[PDB]
Design an enzyme around this catalytic site. Structure first.
Site, PDB file in Angstrom:
ATOM      1  CE1 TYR A 110       0.758  -0.350   4.576  1.00 38.52           C
ATOM      2  CE2 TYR A 110       0.464   1.985   4.128  1.00 38.52           C
ATOM      3  CZ  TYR A 110       0.905   0.974   4.948  1.00 38.52           C
ATOM      4  OH  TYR A 110       1.502   1.302   6.147  1.00 38.52           O
TER       5      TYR A 110
ATOM      6  CG  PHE B  15      -0.003   9.459   5.122  1.00 38.20           C
ATOM      7  CD1 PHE B  15      -0.160   8.381   5.985  1.00 38.20           C
ATOM      8  CD2 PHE B  15      -1.000   9.713   4.189  1.00 38.20           C
ATOM      9  CE1 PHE B  15      -1.274   7.565   5.900  1.00 38.20           C
ATOM     10  CE2 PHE B  15      -2.122   8.907   4.114  1.00 38.20           C
ATOM     11  CZ  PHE B  15      -2.256   7.831   4.965  1.00 38.20           C
ATOM     12  CG  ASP B  16       2.618   4.408   6.331  1.00 34.75           C
ATOM     13  OD1 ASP B  16       3.863   4.299   6.347  1.00 34.75           O
ATOM     14  OD2 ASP B  16       1.851   3.560   6.839  1.00 34.75           O
TER      15      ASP B  16
ATOM     16  CE1 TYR C 266      -5.106   6.303  11.547  1.00 39.91           C
ATOM     17  CE2 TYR C 266      -4.848   7.148   9.314  1.00 39.91           C
ATOM     18  CZ  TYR C 266      -4.615   6.167  10.260  1.00 39.91           C
ATOM     19  OH  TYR C 266      -3.890   5.044   9.914  1.00 39.91           O
TER      20      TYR C 266
ATOM     21  CG  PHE D 235      -4.872   4.311   1.778  1.00 39.76           C
ATOM     22  CD1 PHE D 235      -5.821   5.104   2.412  1.00 39.76           C
ATOM     23  CD2 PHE D 235      -3.697   3.996   2.455  1.00 39.76           C
ATOM     24  CE1 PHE D 235      -5.601   5.589   3.709  1.00 39.76           C
ATOM     25  CE2 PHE D 235      -3.461   4.475   3.747  1.00 39.76           C
ATOM     26  CZ  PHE D 235      -4.418   5.272   4.376  1.00 39.76           C
TER      27      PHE D 235
ATOM     28  CB  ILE E 283      -8.587   3.934   9.096  1.00 37.35           C
ATOM     29  CG1 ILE E 283      -7.869   3.483   7.825  1.00 37.35           C
ATOM     30  CG2 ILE E 283      -7.723   4.837   9.950  1.00 37.35           C
ATOM     31  CD1 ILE E 283      -7.357   4.631   6.964  1.00 37.35           C
TER      32      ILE E 283
END
Ligand code: CPI
Lengths: 112, 113
Positions: free
Chosen positions: A25, A42-43, A87, A104, A61
């Site tokens: 992901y 961010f990730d 979030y 995502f 989430i």
């Protein structure tokens, strides 16, 4: 809540609540002024290794829980996740601002 | 219970009350009892960047911070040992905080708005 876009159709099994999924992901803050609405990344599991979690049991989430159980093994998809399915108003300190819609890219590679 | 505070520098400014905006500098660690000061992997820190500003005591941050920070004075540094129940509970942030992670925070209260 979460909007899915399939960029590669998968044909294997679809994860069900409580199963451990294996996904690659990349997470982005949503910015509608950007291509595919992908703002800052961010990730990401990429480089880190494939990410594993039991799905549908609120260990991630809601947008992932709901998005990933709708996928099939082999599927590549983009999840557009509203802030309240991400979030929410709290955000995540250091990573995700309050009330951030999320984008995502998810690649469902297997079920344990 | 869920949060124990060790004060590492006494502060002498005011103390926050529920609902006030606080300004804190922090470093977050996964708790690891086989490491000095119980500090496992660091997952976040505001050191060297902006402080984190938030209303305190209204569940905008983990309960460990809501309880811990309101017991602090401006200028106080403290180590907050936070159980999963007072941290992020049964949810995790992938790659950073597994579900049901106890947490250690170094917190530094630098202002109240
Ligand atoms: O970093 C981890 O292990 C993951 C587990 C699944 C939930 C999010 N955190």
């Amino acid at each position: 809540g979460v909007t899915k876009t399939t960029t590669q159709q998968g044909t294997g099994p679809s994860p069900q609540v409580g199963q451990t999924v294996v996904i690659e992901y990349t997470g982005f803050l949503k910015d509608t002024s950007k291509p595919d609405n992908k703002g800052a990344q961010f990730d990401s599991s990429v480089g880190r290794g494939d990410f594993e979690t039991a799905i549908g049991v609120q260990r991630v989430i809601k947008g992932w829980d709901e998005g990933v159980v709708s996928m099939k093994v082999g599927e590549k998809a983009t999840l557009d996740i509203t802030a309240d399915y991400g979030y929410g108003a709290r955000g995540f300190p250091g990573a995700i601002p309050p009330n951030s819609d999320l984008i995502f890219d998810v690649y469902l590679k297997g079920i344990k």
